[model samples]
Target: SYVMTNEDFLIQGPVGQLEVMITRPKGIEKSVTGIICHPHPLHGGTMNNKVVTTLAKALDELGLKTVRFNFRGVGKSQGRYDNGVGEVEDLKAVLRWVEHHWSQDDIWLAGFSFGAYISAKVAYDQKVAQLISVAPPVFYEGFASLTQMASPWLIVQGDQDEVVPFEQVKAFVNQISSPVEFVVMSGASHFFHGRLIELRELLVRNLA
Candidate 1:
């Protein structure tokens, strides 16, 4: 087992301070980093979300220092939400800090639900090494209209997701201008519920 070195701090965000929690694997150089965004801020999402922690665990297991942060208006993050616009800026600020501080690019980006939506929006313009979006709400207003894609993109969706709807996710995947990895978990719901281990394993398998 790897030693856990966790740090809690704050970074500048678009509107104000953004709460950050970094979990690093002990006894390793931080060669690469993965920054994960949480779910909807208005919907009780925060850096402490279980799915967000699961992503951090998966990335940590792969020897990558993981970055998890609370979006604006969530947790200790300051300022009110600007829907997804300002949230994207918050993510960019955090990404810039990580890339600059680590002196490395090609970072991995993963998010759950609303965070997934925000991460995908950023990846469309900025190039990332890999992207993992779990249960992206493609049925949302602008999800289907996105054309740009990052390399080695991965989408993990449950077949029985009541929130995002599996059919819309399939449609979003099927009509992608670029090819992407879409994994459908059998008997999994929006949150994966009791299937989190399966989610972590599949991500480690594909991402590691």
Candidate 2:
């Protein structure tokens, strides 16, 4: 088995201390990059969600340090959902923590569902190497805020997604001028029930 360690950490969010689960691949190069996961903050989402776990595992196999954490109002984190506004601040705190603990390394952000929305908003100021939004809730929220993001981005959606749909995600992708890549998972749905390996391959290829 790969030598890895998991730990519990805390960051200060606007509401209070936010809990985080960190998985680190030991013996990696100092120049290694970090991948952070943003899972759905509501409806019982957290660092350990299946999608988030798959992403962390993929990144770890590629020798990257990764962090997956609960957002405000979820898990042991404090505060209630602020309609995804204050959640951005909570993400900022996580970024700051990554920089402090893992200095001299490139950082990447990836999120699923509601997690994707907040990831894109914070990617702009965070200056991460790349941003990945899986099944983003773009259709439900306005895109006026995503214009702030400038990092290279990757957006993956299932063609048959019932919640957000692929066309809407494509249209929003068109509006962004940054270097972005979009991939459609044929026949997969919002949850990506069985196509996770394919998603991991795409992310590994892009990040490579």
Candidate 3:
């Protein structure tokens, strides 16, 4: 049996404390755990951002413990934003903490938009069981490295994304060497808007 526990706490990060929320199925041992990253912090993204929370909830429903945290300078977290550079370190710090507590579990990484970019960057360096990137900005500078990432990956894109062009995302995916389970949600926007339920269903279908 699994009892879901919702925990909110602070973890020591490179600069200061990182605000974190961890949802886990207590009383049962889970072999897979997930780390969820939010969209761009400068654009009002936080751990509780709708898409980020949806990812966490979907993974939780699948019996995977999920951890979501605010990037440095966001919400209760400390330190100013170092663009994407410090955010990557912030994620590494959280990943380290997750390793300390759930060292035996397979780690999975998921992110939205800019968060997707950062998660992909870390996934490139770390050995994760899987990767989920939503609305990743394929036109962005750092995302080209995703071609080198070898983990089992899932990419969920909204065809009508206002932020990331669908054609560019399609083109970028075509150029990548690593295999990815790509699902293009028809008529969905960058934020998914009325399509969150569909996003959740898609994640559950592929991940569960």
Per-candidate TM equals: 0.94, 0.89, 0.94
lDDT of 2: 0.77
- Across 24-97, the per-residue lDDT of candidate 2 in tens digits comes to 66556435555455656667778788888877876777777787778888888888888878888888888877
TM-score of 3: 0.94
Off by over 4 Å in 3: 1-5, 26-29
> Candidate 2 vs candidate 3: which has greater lDDT?
3
Q: Who wins the TM-score comparison?
A: 3
TM-score of 1: 0.94
In candidate 1, what are the lDDT values of residues 1-208, reduced to their tens digit?
Answer: 2223576688888899999988777666457789999998988989898889888888888888888999998888999989788999999999988877776535889999999988888788788888889999887786876755855689999999999898989898888787779998998999989888888998899886
Residue range with the least summed lDDT across 10 consecutive positions in model 2: 29-38
Error of 3 at 147 (Å): 1.1
Give the winner by lDDT.
3
Question: Model 2 off-target regions past 4 Å?
Answer: 1-4
Q: What's the distance in Å from true for residue 206, model 2?
A: 2.5
List per-candidate RMSD values in Å: 2.8, 3.0, 2.4
Give the runs in model 1 whose Cα sits over 4 Å from its true position. 1-5, 27-30
